[PDB]
């Protein structure tokens, strides 16, 4: 929150805080209409800007905010994890029921697409990748990898049953390990950042 003087240069009007700078901007106790953030404190400063008409005193005030994750957890991170679990539960069904696991996989993909659409519409239209975008991308990768792996398992049926059994037993336990390590590294790098 930068404020200064319009029409009065530094040699005419100067600003200053009336009390100690740490105690000048005072936020009330019940004065918080924030729903998504958390006000941590204030921070004042004073400087000079060099414009086309002269130098002007500018008083700066920074309010430090920290976003609360409780909404986005239930909105995106709980549906992504639950949808990934719903994709991974298909590996426990037998290889002889192919339409069942097929509609499992494809409707899990459908859930991921509508989830990504509903979760992308909250954040403004930025032109880079955020952490939620990376999470949705990796979860989509896991779900799609589960479905393509199932397609591979089904394709290997009626020609090589031992290979399909081996790769379905290996992918019945390799998927939770990779998903858990990804969760650990992601939350560790984005909570300690």
């Amino acid at each position: 929150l930068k404020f200064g003087s319009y029409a009065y240069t530094r040699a005419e009007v100067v600003y200053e805080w009336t009390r100690e700078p740490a105690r000048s901007v005072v936020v009330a106790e019940d004065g918080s209409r924030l729903n998504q953030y958390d006000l941590l404190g204030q921070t004042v400063d004073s400087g000079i800007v060099q414009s086309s008409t002269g130098e002007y005193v500018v008083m700066t005030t920074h309010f430090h905010l920290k976003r609360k994750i409780g909404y986005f957890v239930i909105q995106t991170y709980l549906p992504c994890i639950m949808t990934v679990i719903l994709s991974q539960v298909s590996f426990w069904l037998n290889r002889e029921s192919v339409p069942a696991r097929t509609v499992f996989g494809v409707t899990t993909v459908l859930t991921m697409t509508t989830l990504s659409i509903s979760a992308r519409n909250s954040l403004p239209k930025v032109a880079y990748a955020t952490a939620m975008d990376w999470f949705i991308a990796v979860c989509y990768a896991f779900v799609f990898s589960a479905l393509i792996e199932f397609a591979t398992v089904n394709y290997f049926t009626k020609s090589q049953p031992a290979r399909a059994a081996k790769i379905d037993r290996l992918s019945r336990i390799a998927f939770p390990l990779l998903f858990g390590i990804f969760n650990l590294v992601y939350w560790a790098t984005y909570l300690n950042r």
Partner: antibody, heavy 117, light 106 residues
């Protein structure tokens, strides 16, 4: 413009002292007035400040209750009273005023109190 | 209570050379760090008010450099009257000063 302090004091540990700082060249109701102490061959230490236009005073937590700062507007004077001073606060006491970017631009001349028997 | 740590505690230097003094704050002090000069048996004189602003009557060889926590005071062509103590003090909160730096001639 100028701050003038009183002379040195030679008091006994356990009594009270009153130092004065008279301002010439400005009205003390426009700025703050600071009291600083400096021990022999050491760094400065802020005692407290007073807002003469209001009367609000603030003190250092290690000086709350010991020192008390008052002001006299009619003669443009700032007073520092130490209540019960022991055998270690034998320092030089400076009187300062706040400046442009909240700095102490004008300082007094120093009052070197000495406690002994 | 914001503590200001000044370095070095004591130094020696010859005439006509650049010298740099440093002040480090524990907490955030925006640009409200001031540098005072105190000759022996005299009251301190304000040299630099705010971060990088010279006071009226200070030569053009003193200049300050500010940040959120790290502050420097650099002198250029140093003459023979800068044999004094230099204190840094913050004014973002209730003022606290640094320990001081004693410049000497050698």
């Amino acid at each position: 413009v100028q701050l003038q302090q009183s002379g040195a004091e030679l008091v006994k540990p356990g009594a009270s002292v009153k130092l004065s700082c008279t301002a010439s060249g400005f009205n003390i109701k426009d700025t703050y007035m600071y009291w600083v102490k400096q021990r022999p061959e050491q760094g400065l230490e802020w005692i407290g400040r007073i807002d003469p236009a209001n009367g609000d005073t603030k003190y250092d937590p290690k000086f709350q209750g010991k020192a008390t700062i008052t002001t006299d507007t009619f003669s443009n004077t700032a007073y520092l009273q130490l209540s019960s001073l022991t055998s270690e606060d034998t320092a030089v006491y400076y009187c300062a005023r706040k400046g442009l970017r909240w700095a102490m631009d004008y300082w007094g001349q120093g009052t070197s109190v000495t406690v002994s028997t | 209570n914001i503590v200001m740590t000044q370095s070095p505690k004591s130094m020696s230097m010859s005439v006509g050379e650049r010298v740099t003094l440093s002040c480090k704050a524990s907490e955030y002090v925006g640009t409200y760090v001031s540098w005072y000069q105190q000759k022996p048996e005299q009251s301190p004189k304000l040299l630099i008010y705010g971060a990088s602003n010279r006071y009226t009557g200070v030569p053009d060889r003193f200049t300050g450099s500010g940040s959120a926590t790290d502050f420097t005071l650099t002198i250029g062509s140093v003459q023979a009257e800068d044999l004094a103590d230099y204190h840094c003090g913050q004014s973002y909160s209730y003022p606290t000063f640094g320990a001081g730096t004693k410049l000497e001639l050698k």
